[PDB]
Design a protein around this ligand. Structure first.
Ligand SMILES: *[C@@H]1O[C@H](CO)[C@@H](O[C@@H]2O[C@H](CO)[C@@H](O[C@@H]3O[C@H](CO)[C@@H](O)[C@H](O)[C@@H]3O)[C@H](O)[C@H]2NC(C)=O)[C@H](O)[C@H]1NC(C)=O
Ligand SMILES: *[C@@H]1O[C@H](CO)[C@@H](O[C@@H]2O[C@H](CO)[C@@H](O[C@@H]3O[C@H](CO)[C@@H](O)[C@H](O)[C@@H]3O)[C@H](O)[C@H]2NC(C)=O)[C@H](O)[C@H]1NC(C)=O
Ligand SMILES: *[C@@H]1O[C@H](CO)[C@@H](O[C@@H]2O[C@H](CO)[C@@H](O[C@@H]3O[C@H](CO)[C@@H](O)[C@H](O)[C@@H]3O)[C@H](O)[C@H]2NC(C)=O)[C@H](O)[C@H]1NC(C)=O
Ligand SMILES: *[C@@H]1O[C@H](CO)[C@@H](O[C@@H]2O[C@H](CO)[C@@H](O)[C@H](O)[C@H]2NC(C)=O)[C@H](O)[C@H]1NC(C)=O
Ligand SMILES: *[C@@H]1O[C@H](CO)[C@@H](O[C@@H]2O[C@H](CO)[C@@H](O)[C@H](O)[C@H]2NC(C)=O)[C@H](O)[C@H]1NC(C)=O
Ligand SMILES: *[C@@H]1O[C@H](CO)[C@@H](O[C@@H]2O[C@H](CO)[C@@H](O)[C@H](O)[C@H]2NC(C)=O)[C@H](O)[C@H]1NC(C)=O
Ligand SMILES: *[C@@H]1O[C@H](CO)[C@@H](O)[C@H](O)[C@H]1NC(C)=O
Ligand SMILES: *[C@@H]1O[C@H](CO)[C@@H](O)[C@H](O)[C@H]1NC(C)=O
Ligand SMILES: *[C@@H]1O[C@H](CO)[C@@H](O)[C@H](O)[C@H]1NC(C)=O
Lengths: 40, 233, 315, 41
């Protein structure tokens, strides 16, 4: 069924970046993204 | 063609997002609601007595002689004047907030729509390409078109290439390796190119840079020379 | 970045545990409602301000277990796993310098906790530091792309008109100057009590506003007594109503003054938080060409640190 | 300015770019070579 629950909020997913002395990540593709900003 | 198709898809997504999400324009509805509250409260305060026998001036004047009516009227005047002072003060505070928002909107109009901005997250998420304004009630909506990197690949790198006692540095790019050969690529899009004397510049010897690797740097002029007089005679 | 979130029980401030006073208060209309909404709006705004300044990262990034970044020592800005709360040495210093029983001001005045705890803010700061250190400027614009730190710095040097070979030839000098400067930051903040004055001033202004609001309850405002219990104990309702209305007028004006000045301070804090969020995006998640926006000199990089009710940027 | 191999860069063939036009791109090195050993012997 359903109920109201309480929890400690999550801040985000974890991501361990593979940092190394001689390792680089380079985009092989791209996305064109359109977002919206609303101002009074 | 890919860029145009991604743009057109993103615009359709903007229409679907705004259409299907009632809360998308909440900031402007909140401004309208706050002004509606302020005025509904200001009018409702007229029904309060503030200690008077009645909230209606016509009933006070109908029932009492001027000398008593003046007391009841001064109680109502004090209450109504304080209600107006509260309304005006909160309108001035809201006006300051709206002015700050309008100044931000004008700055974004100039820097995002009339140009291209390098300010991170100022003109949307990603690297800014362009923006388009749209009018909205009591406000402006900006559609921010950005370039978002995707599908990154994992490469080996080096700060410099050592050729013949000299350290070669990229002019515009980063050195990468696919595990067998070294190439120079632009940083924001993988496009391997042969490492040459035109792509790189030379400064110093090979014993200074930490992490320098050994690779051939190609010089077109020498290769042509080595073919040009190959016969010799 | 944020302001203390307060809440006022209007009836209990003006007419604490007095039915006769409450009934007289009802004749002034919905003033308690307007004040309640104003303080609720401020309380919500302060959490919005904290969220906008610190919650700018989609994911919580972690540093490698091998904390070697070309010779650049970040141990004084990265979280210290040994101590509870997982704050950096600098963050511990910043929190130490600035200072459920409602023991004080129990006159209808309460303080609400922030939505994000100090630990959550420290976690956002840690994620931002890990992202900048391990992914450079690509972290802010999309997916985090690993880059060796000395190459990130060489790129940042190109960003200011200095070639990459200048950094690579002088990499040891650059790392040593950086480490010395960080040690100087710790010594400067530790030895200068006034370094964090802006945040202590915010705390002091909120403390003054509440101490003044409570102290005003002792004023008579023309009444025979400042205490409602003594007026009701001594006088019959018809005379008590006059004395009570004098006290109601004084207390309501005191609350209106408090709320108005909290709204003005809230606007100032909002402007500061908006500046802090802009600096977080342009200084920490990128490299800025705006002169003096991200520190004195040509900007290379910035590192956030959490502080009570605020943010400290190391430029 | 004259369109040369120093002013421009090369990426891909001529069948990809929409609106590409046909024009000579001048290469200084080849021209010098074509004069340098013109006599041949
Ligand atoms: C870079 O990413 C884009 C997507 O953002 C890639 O283009 C996409 O390629 C897939 C195929 O791998 C397309 O899916 C196919 O679409 C046709 C449409 O008729 C359909 O019949 C197929 O069954 C399949 O669904 C997809 O539509 C296409 N997207 C766009 C916007 O063109 C692109 O290939 C990637 N490039 C590289 C080098 O990875
Ligand atoms: C990065 O820098 C830190 C310090 O800036 C290095 O760790 C150690 O830090 C302490 C101070 O925090 C240094 O002084 C020590 O202080 C204690 C205080 O009780 C004292 O008992 C010790 O005798 C010492 O004076 C300590 O010297 C320093 N460690 C070293 C080896 O110098 C940290 O090691 C640095 N990281 C790298 C990778 O170099
Ligand atoms: C550019 O300026 C830097 C300083 O910001 C110069 O590096 C500094 O050079 C002096 C020597 O001229 C170093 O002093 C020496 O340090 C050793 C440490 O063991 C000490 O034993 C000596 O008695 C003397 O005190 C100083 O430490 C060093 N600073 C750093 C951060 O490396 C650099 O040489 C200058 N470059 C040019 C081209 O002028
Ligand atoms: C790294 O890239 C090079 C260049 O593309 C690869 O070598 C080439 O592979 C293609 C495969 O069709 C051949 O046609 C070329 O002749 C090769 N060139 C040379 C100079 O060998 C190489 O295999 C790649 N290595 C990895 C691990 O991806
Ligand atoms: C790059 O090539 C040079 C030679 O052109 C290497 O230098 C030699 O390194 C060996 C290492 O055992 C020494 O014994 C030689 O005396 C070196 N010769 C010279 C002229 O320096 C260099 O080590 C190579 N670098 C890498 C990373 O492989
Ligand atoms: C640029 O020149 C090329 C030839 O160097 C043209 O390609 C030819 O176009 C004709 C068009 O009728 C074809 O019949 C030939 O078979 C093509 N040859 C080759 C090798 O592609 C090209 O069309 C010219 N472009 C423009 C815009 O004039
Ligand atoms: C980078 O090089 C240093 C050289 O001392 C080494 O200690 C460190 O572990 C290396 N980093 C990685 C990820 O291998
Ligand atoms: C990149 O490649 C190395 C091996 O060359 C590997 O160890 C590393 O995990 C790779 N990165 C990722 C994100 O998998
Ligand atoms: C509530 O009281 C108990 C003791 O009766 C105490 O142990 C506990 O910590 C208290 N909780 C709070 C939130 O103060």
């Amino acid at each position: 069924s359903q109920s109201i629950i309480a929890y400690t909020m999550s801040l985000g997913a974890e991501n361990s970046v593979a940092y190394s002395n001689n390792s680089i990540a380079i985009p092989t593709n791209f996305t064109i993204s359109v977002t919206t900003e609303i101002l009074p | 063609k890919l860029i145009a198709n991604q743009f057109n898809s993103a615009i359709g997504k903007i229409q679907d997002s705004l259409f299907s999400t009632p809360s998308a324009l909440g900031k402007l509805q909140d401004v309208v609601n706050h002004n509606a509250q302020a005025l509904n409260t200001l009018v409702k305060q007229l029904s309060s007595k503030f200690g008077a026998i009645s909230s209606v001036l016509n009933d006070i004047l109908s029932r009492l002689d001027p000398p008593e009516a003046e007391v009841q009227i001064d109680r109502l005047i004090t209450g109504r004047l304080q209600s107006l002072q509260t309304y005006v003060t909160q309108q001035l505070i809201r006006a300051a907030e709206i002015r700050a928002s309008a100044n931000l909107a004008a700055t974004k109009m100039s820097e995002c729509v009339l140009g291209q901005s390098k300010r991170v997250d100022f003109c949307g998420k990603g690297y800014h390409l362009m923006s388009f304004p749209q009018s909205a009630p009591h406000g402006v909506v900006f559609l921010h078109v950005t370039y978002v990197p995707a599908q990154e690949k994992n490469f080996t790198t080096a700060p410099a290439i050592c050729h013949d006692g000299k350290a070669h540095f990229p002019r515009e790019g980063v050195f990468v390796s696919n595990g067998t050969h070294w190439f120079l690529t632009q940083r924001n899009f993988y496009e391997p190119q042969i490492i040459t004397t035109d792509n790189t510049f030379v400064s110093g010897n090979c014993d200074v840079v930490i992490g320098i690797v050994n690779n051939t740097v190609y010089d077109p002029l020498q290769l042509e020379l080595d073919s040009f007089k190959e016969e010799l005679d | 970045v944020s302001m203390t979130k307060t809440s006022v029980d209007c009836t209990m401030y003006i007419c604490g545990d007095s039915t006769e006073c409450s009934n007289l208060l009802l004749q002034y209309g919905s003033f308690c409602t307007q004040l309640k909404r104003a303080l609720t709006g401020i309380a919500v705004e302060q959490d919005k301000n904290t969220q906008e300044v610190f919650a700018q990262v989609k994911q919580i990034y972690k540093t490698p277990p091998i904390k070697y970044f070309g010779g650049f020592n970040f141990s004084q800005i990265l979280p210290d796993p040994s101590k509870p709360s997982k704050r950096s040495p600098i963050e511990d210093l910043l929190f130490n310098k600035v200072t459920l029983i409602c023991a004080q001001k129990f006159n209808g005045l309460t303080v609400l906790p922030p939505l994000l705890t100090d630990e959550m803010i420290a976690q956002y700061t840690s994620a931002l530091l890990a992202g900048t250190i391990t992914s450079g400027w690509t972290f802010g614009a999309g997916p985090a792309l690993q880059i060796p730190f000395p190459m990130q710095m060489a790129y940042r040097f190109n960003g200011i008109g200095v070639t990459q070979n200048v950094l690579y030839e002088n990499q040891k000098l650059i790392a040593n100057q950086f480490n010395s400067a960080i040690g100087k930051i710790q010594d400067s903040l530790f030895s200068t009590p006034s370094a964090l004055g802006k945040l202590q001033d915010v705390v002091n202004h909120n403390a003054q506003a509440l101490n003044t609001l409570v102290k005003q309850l002792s004023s008579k405002f023309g009444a025979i007594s400042s205490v409602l219990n003594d007026i009701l104990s001594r006088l019959d309702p018809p005379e008590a109503e006059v004395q009570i209305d004098r006290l109601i007028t004084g207390r309501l004006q005191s609350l209106q003054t408090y709320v108005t000045q909290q709204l003005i301070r809230a606007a100032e804090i909002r402007a500061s938080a908006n500046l802090a969020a802009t600096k977080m995006s342009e200084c920490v998640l990128g490299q800025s060409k705006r002169v003096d926006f991200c520190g004195k000199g040509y900007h290379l990089m910035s590192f956030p640190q959490s502080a009570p009710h605020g943010v400290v940027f190391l430029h």
